[PDB]
Amino acid sequence: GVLYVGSKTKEGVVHGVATVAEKTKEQVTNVGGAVVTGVTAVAQ
Amino acid sequence: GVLYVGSKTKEGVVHGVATVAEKTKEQVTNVGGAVVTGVTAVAQ
Amino acid sequence: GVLYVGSKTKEGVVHGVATVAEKTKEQVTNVGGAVVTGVTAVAQ
Amino acid sequence: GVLYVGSKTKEGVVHGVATVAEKTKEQVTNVGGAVVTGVTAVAQ
Amino acid sequence: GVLYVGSKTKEGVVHGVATVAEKTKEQVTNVGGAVVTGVTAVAQ
Amino acid sequence: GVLYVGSKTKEGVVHGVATVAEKTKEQVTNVGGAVVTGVTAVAQ
Amino acid sequence: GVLYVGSKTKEGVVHGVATVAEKTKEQVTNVGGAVVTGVTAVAQ
Amino acid sequence: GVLYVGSKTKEGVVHGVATVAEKTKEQVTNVGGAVVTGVTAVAQ
């Protein structure tokens, strides 16, 4: 795993994960990952 | 296991991970994510 | 390894982990992430 | 490893971890995490 | 004689007049133009 | 007049008037132009 | 003759008027001009 | 005869009148000109 990425943009608005609830009961997020190369995840 | 991330950008906004609510009851966020290479996790 | 994180950006903002409520009952934000390379975690 | 993190950005702000409540019951935030390489963590 | 020029461009490379001579023997230029309203020029 | 010029541009390059020459034997440039409203010029 | 010049730009470069030669034998740059709301020039 | 000039820029260069020669004979370079309201000029 010898990656190089994350290069030039000359712009950008990144937002990832955004959890907006309203007049509700519940939310459960478990987000994991944006760029991987060798993931051996057990039980996320 | 090398890594070259976050190169030239010339601008850039990142709101990462947010959370908003209004009049709710429950929220839960278990975020474990961005650019990874090798994650041998147990039980994230 | 021979990892290089962070290079030239020539501007940049970041809000990271924001967390708003209004008249909730509960919020629970449990972030455990950014740019990683090895996470052999047990039970985040 | 060699792990030559960080570089000059020629501008930049950061907000990191915020929190705002309004007329709520209360909130809870168990955050921990940022730019990191080898994390053999046990329970957060 | 109201105007509103030079509004939003969000990038731009203007050049106007680039008089270039290469292995010539003469050149004459008399550029007298852009956004106008009321020119009464008695030469040019 | 009741002019307005030069609103937002968010980047911008001009070269106005250049005059590059090589191996030539003459040149004349008489530029009298940008954004005008009322010009009563005589004998430019 | 209200001349609202140059509102907010948020960047911008200007190379104005320029004059290069190489192995030439004359250049004669006679510029007079930019943003105008009156010019009654006699014999530029 | 109002004139406002030079509002917000947040970066910027200016080069104005430049001149480079190589083995010329002359560069009779007679520049005028800027952001101007009322010119009644006689001979230049």
mmCIF file of C-alpha atoms in Angstrom:
data_model
loop_
_atom_site.group_PDB
_atom_site.id
_atom_site.type_symbol
_atom_site.label_atom_id
_atom_site.label_comp_id
_atom_site.label_asym_id
_atom_site.label_seq_id
_atom_site.Cartn_x
_atom_site.Cartn_y
_atom_site.Cartn_z
ATOM 1 C CA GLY A 1 0.000 0.000 0.000
ATOM 2 C CA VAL A 2 2.039 2.879 -1.357
ATOM 3 C CA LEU A 3 -0.669 5.364 -2.373
ATOM 4 C CA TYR A 4 -0.071 9.058 -3.217
ATOM 5 C CA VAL A 5 -3.561 10.451 -3.551
ATOM 6 C CA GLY A 6 -4.862 13.743 -2.150
ATOM 7 C CA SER A 7 -3.450 15.898 -4.947
ATOM 8 C CA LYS A 8 -4.207 19.275 -6.550
ATOM 9 C CA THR A 9 -7.711 20.739 -6.524
ATOM 10 C CA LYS A 10 -7.583 24.583 -6.934
ATOM 11 C CA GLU A 11 -11.065 24.512 -5.349
ATOM 12 C CA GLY A 12 -12.969 22.628 -2.759
ATOM 13 C CA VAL A 13 -15.751 22.252 -0.195
ATOM 14 C CA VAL A 14 -15.651 18.886 1.597
ATOM 15 C CA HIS A 15 -18.372 17.743 3.995
ATOM 16 C CA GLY A 16 -17.612 14.175 5.105
ATOM 17 C CA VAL A 17 -20.620 13.127 7.199
ATOM 18 C CA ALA A 18 -23.396 15.433 8.371
ATOM 19 C CA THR A 19 -26.220 14.196 10.571
ATOM 20 C CA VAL A 20 -29.172 16.569 10.678
ATOM 21 C CA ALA A 21 -32.317 15.408 12.429
ATOM 22 C CA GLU A 22 -35.367 17.497 13.277
ATOM 23 C CA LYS A 23 -38.580 16.735 15.219
ATOM 24 C CA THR A 24 -37.628 13.074 15.202
ATOM 25 C CA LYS A 25 -36.834 10.275 17.583
ATOM 26 C CA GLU A 26 -33.496 8.710 16.772
ATOM 27 C CA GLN A 27 -30.397 8.404 14.605
ATOM 28 C CA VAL A 28 -27.420 6.073 14.790
ATOM 29 C CA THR A 29 -24.600 6.407 12.307
ATOM 30 C CA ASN A 30 -21.430 4.346 12.270
ATOM 31 C CA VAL A 31 -19.575 5.772 9.280
ATOM 32 C CA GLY A 32 -16.037 4.645 8.690
ATOM 33 C CA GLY A 33 -13.892 5.085 5.601
ATOM 34 C CA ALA A 34 -12.947 7.517 2.884
ATOM 35 C CA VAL A 35 -10.011 5.908 1.035
ATOM 36 C CA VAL A 36 -8.576 2.509 1.968
ATOM 37 C CA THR A 37 -5.958 0.167 0.609
ATOM 38 C CA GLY A 38 -5.548 -2.804 2.914
ATOM 39 C CA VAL A 39 -8.450 -2.864 5.370
ATOM 40 C CA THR A 40 -9.065 -6.138 7.200
ATOM 41 C CA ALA A 41 -11.741 -4.780 9.544
ATOM 42 C CA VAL A 42 -13.489 -7.200 11.912
ATOM 43 C CA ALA A 43 -17.020 -6.405 13.078
ATOM 44 C CA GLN A 44 -17.714 -2.725 12.341
ATOM 45 C CA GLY B 1 3.527 0.812 3.826
ATOM 46 C CA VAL B 2 4.036 4.423 2.815
ATOM 47 C CA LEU B 3 1.542 7.238 2.367
ATOM 48 C CA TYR B 4 1.632 10.642 0.640
ATOM 49 C CA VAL B 5 -1.585 12.470 1.405
ATOM 50 C CA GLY B 6 -2.880 16.027 1.477
ATOM 51 C CA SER B 7 -0.976 17.695 -1.379
ATOM 52 C CA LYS B 8 -1.464 21.124 -3.061
ATOM 53 C CA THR B 9 -4.907 22.656 -2.818
ATOM 54 C CA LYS B 10 -4.827 26.477 -3.423
ATOM 55 C CA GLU B 11 -8.118 26.694 -1.397
ATOM 56 C CA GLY B 12 -10.271 24.287 0.583
ATOM 57 C CA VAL B 13 -13.063 23.927 3.115
ATOM 58 C CA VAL B 14 -13.866 20.812 5.118
ATOM 59 C CA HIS B 15 -16.718 20.541 7.611
ATOM 60 C CA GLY B 16 -15.447 17.077 8.571
ATOM 61 C CA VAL B 17 -18.166 15.565 10.744
ATOM 62 C CA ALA B 18 -21.102 17.610 11.974
ATOM 63 C CA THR B 19 -24.255 17.004 13.998
ATOM 64 C CA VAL B 20 -27.368 19.149 14.332
ATOM 65 C CA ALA B 21 -30.760 18.480 15.835
ATOM 66 C CA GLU B 22 -33.974 20.234 16.844
ATOM 67 C CA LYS B 23 -36.737 18.924 19.181
ATOM 68 C CA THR B 24 -35.362 15.396 18.845
ATOM 69 C CA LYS B 25 -35.058 12.583 21.333
ATOM 70 C CA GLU B 26 -31.868 10.720 20.488
ATOM 71 C CA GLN B 27 -28.708 10.893 18.390
ATOM 72 C CA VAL B 28 -25.574 8.745 18.349
ATOM 73 C CA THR B 29 -22.536 8.982 16.087
ATOM 74 C CA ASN B 30 -19.672 6.481 16.134
ATOM 75 C CA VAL B 31 -17.504 7.833 13.308
ATOM 76 C CA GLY B 32 -14.128 6.199 12.808
ATOM 77 C CA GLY B 33 -13.364 7.238 9.249
ATOM 78 C CA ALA B 34 -11.074 9.241 7.002
ATOM 79 C CA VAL B 35 -8.238 8.279 4.633
ATOM 80 C CA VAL B 36 -6.833 5.019 6.043
ATOM 81 C CA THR B 37 -4.377 2.569 4.616
ATOM 82 C CA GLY B 38 -4.495 -0.663 6.596
ATOM 83 C CA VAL B 39 -6.892 -1.035 9.501
ATOM 84 C CA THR B 40 -6.960 -4.360 11.283
ATOM 85 C CA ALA B 41 -9.680 -3.151 13.689
ATOM 86 C CA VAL B 42 -11.858 -5.216 15.996
ATOM 87 C CA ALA B 43 -15.342 -3.924 16.878
ATOM 88 C CA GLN B 44 -15.423 -0.292 15.692
ATOM 89 C CA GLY C 1 6.242 3.989 7.049
ATOM 90 C CA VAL C 2 7.943 6.824 5.180
ATOM 91 C CA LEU C 3 4.583 8.644 5.544
ATOM 92 C CA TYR C 4 4.084 12.297 4.552
ATOM 93 C CA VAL C 5 0.843 13.853 5.711
ATOM 94 C CA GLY C 6 0.100 17.515 5.199
ATOM 95 C CA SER C 7 1.365 19.670 2.353
ATOM 96 C CA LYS C 8 0.825 23.124 0.870
ATOM 97 C CA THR C 9 -2.716 24.426 0.796
ATOM 98 C CA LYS C 10 -2.422 28.190 0.151
ATOM 99 C CA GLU C 11 -5.706 28.722 2.044
ATOM 100 C CA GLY C 12 -7.955 26.557 4.186
ATOM 101 C CA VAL C 13 -10.631 26.384 6.832
ATOM 102 C CA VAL C 14 -11.836 23.372 8.806
ATOM 103 C CA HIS C 15 -14.634 23.052 11.351
ATOM 104 C CA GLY C 16 -13.772 19.483 12.362
ATOM 105 C CA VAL C 17 -16.411 18.198 14.797
ATOM 106 C CA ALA C 18 -19.318 20.603 15.235
ATOM 107 C CA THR C 19 -22.298 19.576 17.352
ATOM 108 C CA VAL C 20 -25.458 21.657 17.738
ATOM 109 C CA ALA C 21 -28.721 20.825 19.452
ATOM 110 C CA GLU C 22 -31.929 22.635 20.286
ATOM 111 C CA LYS C 23 -34.524 21.361 22.820
ATOM 112 C CA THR C 24 -33.217 17.788 22.516
ATOM 113 C CA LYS C 25 -33.259 15.059 25.074
ATOM 114 C CA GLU C 26 -29.887 13.562 24.240
ATOM 115 C CA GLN C 27 -26.928 13.784 21.905
ATOM 116 C CA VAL C 28 -23.905 11.493 22.042
ATOM 117 C CA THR C 29 -21.079 12.153 19.598
ATOM 118 C CA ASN C 30 -18.204 9.684 19.775
ATOM 119 C CA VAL C 31 -15.802 10.544 16.924
ATOM 120 C CA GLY C 32 -12.655 8.459 16.657
ATOM 121 C CA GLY C 33 -11.146 9.279 13.277
ATOM 122 C CA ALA C 34 -8.913 11.219 10.922
ATOM 123 C CA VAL C 35 -6.201 10.188 8.466
ATOM 124 C CA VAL C 36 -4.913 6.907 9.961
ATOM 125 C CA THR C 37 -2.465 4.263 8.764
ATOM 126 C CA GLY C 38 -2.814 1.481 11.260
ATOM 127 C CA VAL C 39 -5.639 1.009 13.736
ATOM 128 C CA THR C 40 -5.752 -2.324 15.500
ATOM 129 C CA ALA C 41 -8.376 -0.946 17.869
ATOM 130 C CA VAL C 42 -10.516 -2.948 20.226
ATOM 131 C CA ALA C 43 -13.991 -1.564 20.899
ATOM 132 C CA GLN C 44 -14.271 2.117 20.031
ATOM 133 C CA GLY D 1 8.598 5.006 10.836
ATOM 134 C CA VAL D 2 10.038 8.178 9.372
ATOM 135 C CA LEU D 3 6.614 9.732 9.447
ATOM 136 C CA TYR D 4 7.487 13.252 8.319
ATOM 137 C CA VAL D 5 4.114 14.833 9.080
ATOM 138 C CA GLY D 6 3.035 18.444 8.680
ATOM 139 C CA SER D 7 3.869 21.263 6.276
ATOM 140 C CA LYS D 8 3.370 24.971 5.673
ATOM 141 C CA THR D 9 -0.026 26.103 4.491
ATOM 142 C CA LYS D 10 0.391 29.861 3.818
ATOM 143 C CA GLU D 11 -2.987 30.530 5.480
ATOM 144 C CA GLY D 12 -5.422 28.525 7.600
ATOM 145 C CA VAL D 13 -8.014 28.480 10.375
ATOM 146 C CA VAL D 14 -9.462 25.553 12.359
ATOM 147 C CA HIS D 15 -12.396 25.070 14.741
ATOM 148 C CA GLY D 16 -11.687 21.504 15.858
ATOM 149 C CA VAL D 17 -14.470 20.449 18.232
ATOM 150 C CA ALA D 18 -17.387 22.741 19.048
ATOM 151 C CA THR D 19 -20.707 22.313 20.867
ATOM 152 C CA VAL D 20 -23.845 24.450 21.315
ATOM 153 C CA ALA D 21 -26.996 23.633 23.284
ATOM 154 C CA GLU D 22 -30.271 25.582 23.376
ATOM 155 C CA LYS D 23 -33.086 25.018 25.915
ATOM 156 C CA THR D 24 -32.308 21.299 25.945
ATOM 157 C CA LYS D 25 -32.168 18.590 28.508
ATOM 158 C CA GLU D 26 -28.373 18.153 28.084
ATOM 159 C CA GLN D 27 -25.866 16.649 25.672
ATOM 160 C CA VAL D 28 -22.894 14.313 25.956
ATOM 161 C CA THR D 29 -19.780 14.163 23.796
ATOM 162 C CA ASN D 30 -17.179 11.413 24.137
ATOM 163 C CA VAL D 31 -14.964 12.517 21.253
ATOM 164 C CA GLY D 32 -11.353 11.599 20.823
ATOM 165 C CA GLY D 33 -9.378 11.471 17.587
ATOM 166 C CA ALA D 34 -7.241 13.314 15.028
ATOM 167 C CA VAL D 35 -4.399 12.829 12.527
ATOM 168 C CA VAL D 36 -2.585 9.705 13.699
ATOM 169 C CA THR D 37 -0.765 6.636 12.378
ATOM 170 C CA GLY D 38 -0.532 3.580 14.631
ATOM 171 C CA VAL D 39 -3.289 3.269 17.215
ATOM 172 C CA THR D 40 -3.517 -0.008 19.093
ATOM 173 C CA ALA D 41 -6.208 1.446 21.350
ATOM 174 C CA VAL D 42 -8.389 -0.560 23.711
ATOM 175 C CA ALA D 43 -11.873 0.694 24.669
ATOM 176 C CA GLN D 44 -12.781 4.344 24.137
ATOM 177 C CA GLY E 1 -24.142 57.852 -18.800
ATOM 178 C CA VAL E 2 -24.573 55.165 -16.165
ATOM 179 C CA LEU E 3 -22.475 51.981 -16.330
ATOM 180 C CA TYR E 4 -21.924 48.827 -14.304
ATOM 181 C CA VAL E 5 -19.081 46.938 -15.952
ATOM 182 C CA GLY E 6 -16.355 44.647 -14.623
ATOM 183 C CA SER E 7 -18.795 42.470 -12.674
ATOM 184 C CA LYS E 8 -18.242 38.928 -11.346
ATOM 185 C CA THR E 9 -15.811 36.808 -13.305
ATOM 186 C CA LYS E 10 -14.561 34.176 -10.796
ATOM 187 C CA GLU E 11 -11.332 33.802 -12.881
ATOM 188 C CA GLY E 12 -9.986 35.652 -15.875
ATOM 189 C CA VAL E 13 -6.928 36.406 -17.979
ATOM 190 C CA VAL E 14 -7.305 39.699 -19.870
ATOM 191 C CA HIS E 15 -4.756 40.754 -22.492
ATOM 192 C CA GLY E 16 -5.928 44.032 -24.056
ATOM 193 C CA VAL E 17 -3.383 44.568 -26.843
ATOM 194 C CA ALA E 18 -0.257 42.441 -27.163
ATOM 195 C CA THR E 19 1.576 44.038 -30.064
ATOM 196 C CA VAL E 20 4.275 41.544 -31.004
ATOM 197 C CA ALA E 21 6.713 41.935 -33.874
ATOM 198 C CA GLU E 22 9.270 39.322 -34.892
ATOM 199 C CA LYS E 23 11.659 39.867 -37.848
ATOM 200 C CA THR E 24 9.553 42.731 -39.202
ATOM 201 C CA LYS E 25 10.323 46.240 -40.336
ATOM 202 C CA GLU E 26 7.406 48.273 -38.956
ATOM 203 C CA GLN E 27 4.331 48.335 -36.720
ATOM 204 C CA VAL E 28 1.871 51.066 -35.725
ATOM 205 C CA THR E 29 -1.030 50.618 -33.306
ATOM 206 C CA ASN E 30 -3.613 53.128 -32.122
ATOM 207 C CA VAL E 31 -6.076 51.139 -30.003
ATOM 208 C CA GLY E 32 -8.734 53.395 -28.527
ATOM 209 C CA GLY E 33 -11.478 51.023 -27.489
ATOM 210 C CA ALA E 34 -13.373 49.445 -24.612
ATOM 211 C CA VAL E 35 -16.845 49.851 -23.093
ATOM 212 C CA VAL E 36 -17.952 53.392 -24.017
ATOM 213 C CA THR E 37 -21.058 55.553 -24.022
ATOM 214 C CA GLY E 38 -20.477 58.878 -25.681
ATOM 215 C CA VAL E 39 -17.306 59.023 -27.803
ATOM 216 C CA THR E 40 -17.086 62.004 -30.148
ATOM 217 C CA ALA E 41 -13.482 61.373 -31.227
ATOM 218 C CA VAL E 42 -12.145 63.620 -34.006
ATOM 219 C CA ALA E 43 -9.338 61.183 -34.678
ATOM 220 C CA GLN E 44 -8.081 57.706 -33.815
ATOM 221 C CA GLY F 1 -22.021 59.891 -15.465
ATOM 222 C CA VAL F 2 -22.999 57.839 -12.436
ATOM 223 C CA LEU F 3 -20.580 55.042 -13.288
ATOM 224 C CA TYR F 4 -19.699 51.895 -11.353
ATOM 225 C CA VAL F 5 -16.713 49.836 -12.484
ATOM 226 C CA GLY F 6 -14.719 46.967 -11.066
ATOM 227 C CA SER F 7 -16.929 44.609 -9.079
ATOM 228 C CA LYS F 8 -15.978 41.143 -7.785
ATOM 229 C CA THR F 9 -13.489 39.107 -9.698
ATOM 230 C CA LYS F 10 -12.228 36.405 -7.278
ATOM 231 C CA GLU F 11 -9.086 36.096 -9.451
ATOM 232 C CA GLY F 12 -7.742 38.102 -12.344
ATOM 233 C CA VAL F 13 -4.786 38.762 -14.616
ATOM 234 C CA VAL F 14 -4.331 41.502 -17.166
ATOM 235 C CA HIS F 15 -1.448 42.208 -19.469
ATOM 236 C CA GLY F 16 -2.838 45.631 -20.385
ATOM 237 C CA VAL F 17 -0.639 46.538 -23.291
ATOM 238 C CA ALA F 18 2.518 44.594 -24.010
ATOM 239 C CA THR F 19 5.021 45.382 -26.728
ATOM 240 C CA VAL F 20 7.409 42.524 -27.361
ATOM 241 C CA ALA F 21 9.655 42.899 -30.371
ATOM 242 C CA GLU F 22 12.617 41.037 -31.788
ATOM 243 C CA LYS F 23 14.972 41.749 -34.723
ATOM 244 C CA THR F 24 12.545 44.412 -35.924
ATOM 245 C CA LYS F 25 13.397 47.820 -37.260
ATOM 246 C CA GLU F 26 10.498 49.915 -35.974
ATOM 247 C CA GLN F 27 7.507 50.108 -33.681
ATOM 248 C CA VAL F 28 4.995 52.746 -32.607
ATOM 249 C CA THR F 29 2.117 52.143 -30.193
ATOM 250 C CA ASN F 30 -0.408 54.836 -29.313
ATOM 251 C CA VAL F 31 -2.969 53.085 -27.102
ATOM 252 C CA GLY F 32 -5.596 55.394 -25.661
ATOM 253 C CA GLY F 33 -8.217 52.874 -24.656
ATOM 254 C CA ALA F 34 -9.988 51.501 -21.639
ATOM 255 C CA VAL F 35 -13.484 51.835 -20.213
ATOM 256 C CA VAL F 36 -14.682 55.388 -20.930
ATOM 257 C CA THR F 37 -18.034 57.123 -20.956
ATOM 258 C CA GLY F 38 -17.691 60.475 -22.696
ATOM 259 C CA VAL F 39 -14.586 61.231 -24.734
ATOM 260 C CA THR F 40 -14.264 64.264 -26.941
ATOM 261 C CA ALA F 41 -10.679 63.519 -28.047
ATOM 262 C CA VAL F 42 -9.006 65.543 -30.805
ATOM 263 C CA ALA F 43 -6.075 64.177 -32.804
ATOM 264 C CA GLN F 44 -4.956 61.044 -30.930
ATOM 265 C CA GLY G 1 -19.185 62.557 -12.625
ATOM 266 C CA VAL G 2 -19.221 59.861 -9.940
ATOM 267 C CA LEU G 3 -16.583 57.263 -10.744
ATOM 268 C CA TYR G 4 -16.959 54.214 -8.477
ATOM 269 C CA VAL G 5 -13.723 52.457 -9.336
ATOM 270 C CA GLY G 6 -12.512 49.077 -8.204
ATOM 271 C CA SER G 7 -14.723 47.380 -5.630
ATOM 272 C CA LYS G 8 -13.776 44.181 -3.811
ATOM 273 C CA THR G 9 -11.733 41.802 -5.905
ATOM 274 C CA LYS G 10 -10.448 39.077 -3.508
ATOM 275 C CA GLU G 11 -7.409 38.677 -5.820
ATOM 276 C CA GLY G 12 -5.906 40.263 -8.918
ATOM 277 C CA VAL G 13 -2.637 41.017 -10.700
ATOM 278 C CA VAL G 14 -1.863 43.687 -13.293
ATOM 279 C CA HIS G 15 1.157 43.771 -15.593
ATOM 280 C CA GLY G 16 0.066 47.263 -16.687
ATOM 281 C CA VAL G 17 2.120 48.410 -19.688
ATOM 282 C CA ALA G 18 5.231 46.462 -20.673
ATOM 283 C CA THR G 19 7.877 46.817 -23.362
ATOM 284 C CA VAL G 20 10.402 44.126 -24.263
ATOM 285 C CA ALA G 21 12.910 44.113 -27.094
ATOM 286 C CA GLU G 22 15.764 41.920 -28.294
ATOM 287 C CA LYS G 23 18.229 42.835 -31.102
ATOM 288 C CA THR G 24 15.681 45.394 -32.287
ATOM 289 C CA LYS G 25 16.290 48.893 -33.518
ATOM 290 C CA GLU G 26 13.369 50.877 -32.088
ATOM 291 C CA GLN G 27 10.322 50.744 -29.886
ATOM 292 C CA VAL G 28 8.217 53.819 -29.134
ATOM 293 C CA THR G 29 5.383 53.143 -26.700
ATOM 294 C CA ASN G 30 3.201 56.201 -26.179
ATOM 295 C CA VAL G 31 0.380 54.956 -23.933
ATOM 296 C CA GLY G 32 -2.074 57.273 -22.362
ATOM 297 C CA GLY G 33 -5.231 55.620 -21.098
ATOM 298 C CA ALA G 34 -7.232 53.791 -18.433
ATOM 299 C CA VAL G 35 -10.778 54.022 -17.042
ATOM 300 C CA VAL G 36 -12.228 57.431 -17.949
ATOM 301 C CA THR G 37 -15.333 59.574 -17.512
ATOM 302 C CA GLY G 38 -14.007 62.465 -19.544
ATOM 303 C CA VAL G 39 -11.019 63.016 -21.820
ATOM 304 C CA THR G 40 -10.903 66.016 -24.116
ATOM 305 C CA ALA G 41 -7.289 65.388 -25.156
ATOM 306 C CA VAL G 42 -5.809 67.615 -27.831
ATOM 307 C CA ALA G 43 -2.986 65.961 -29.776
ATOM 308 C CA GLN G 44 -1.792 62.952 -27.792
ATOM 309 C CA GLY H 1 -16.257 64.990 -9.537
ATOM 310 C CA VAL H 2 -16.003 62.163 -7.041
ATOM 311 C CA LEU H 3 -13.721 59.143 -7.454
ATOM 312 C CA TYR H 4 -13.326 56.160 -5.130
ATOM 313 C CA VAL H 5 -10.473 53.797 -5.956
ATOM 314 C CA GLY H 6 -8.797 50.665 -4.680
ATOM 315 C CA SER H 7 -11.155 48.670 -2.491
ATOM 316 C CA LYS H 8 -10.533 45.215 -0.988
ATOM 317 C CA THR H 9 -8.033 42.964 -2.739
ATOM 318 C CA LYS H 10 -6.836 40.198 -0.362
ATOM 319 C CA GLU H 11 -3.779 39.779 -2.619
ATOM 320 C CA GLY H 12 -2.285 41.607 -5.582
ATOM 321 C CA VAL H 13 0.785 42.632 -7.553
ATOM 322 C CA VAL H 14 1.275 45.549 -9.964
ATOM 323 C CA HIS H 15 4.002 46.034 -12.576
ATOM 324 C CA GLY H 16 3.095 49.390 -14.113
ATOM 325 C CA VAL H 17 5.723 50.261 -16.726
ATOM 326 C CA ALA H 18 8.462 47.691 -17.255
ATOM 327 C CA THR H 19 11.132 47.650 -19.979
ATOM 328 C CA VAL H 20 13.794 45.111 -21.007
ATOM 329 C CA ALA H 21 16.224 45.600 -23.908
ATOM 330 C CA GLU H 22 18.887 43.586 -25.753
ATOM 331 C CA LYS H 23 21.204 45.471 -28.147
ATOM 332 C CA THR H 24 18.568 48.074 -29.107
ATOM 333 C CA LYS H 25 19.016 51.510 -30.476
ATOM 334 C CA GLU H 26 16.321 53.277 -28.428
ATOM 335 C CA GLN H 27 13.060 52.816 -26.558
ATOM 336 C CA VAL H 28 11.478 56.262 -26.493
ATOM 337 C CA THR H 29 8.821 55.183 -24.048
ATOM 338 C CA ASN H 30 6.492 58.013 -23.242
ATOM 339 C CA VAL H 31 3.865 56.504 -20.970
ATOM 340 C CA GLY H 32 0.996 58.372 -19.367
ATOM 341 C CA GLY H 33 -2.325 57.111 -18.167
ATOM 342 C CA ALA H 34 -4.199 56.015 -15.030
ATOM 343 C CA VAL H 35 -7.786 55.825 -13.802
ATOM 344 C CA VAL H 36 -8.773 59.411 -14.474
ATOM 345 C CA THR H 37 -11.914 61.568 -14.385
ATOM 346 C CA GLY H 38 -11.370 64.651 -16.557
ATOM 347 C CA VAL H 39 -8.395 65.262 -18.822
ATOM 348 C CA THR H 40 -8.126 68.335 -21.005
ATOM 349 C CA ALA H 41 -4.533 67.591 -22.018
ATOM 350 C CA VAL H 42 -2.649 69.412 -24.757
ATOM 351 C CA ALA H 43 0.274 67.885 -26.708
ATOM 352 C CA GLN H 44 2.137 64.861 -25.376
#
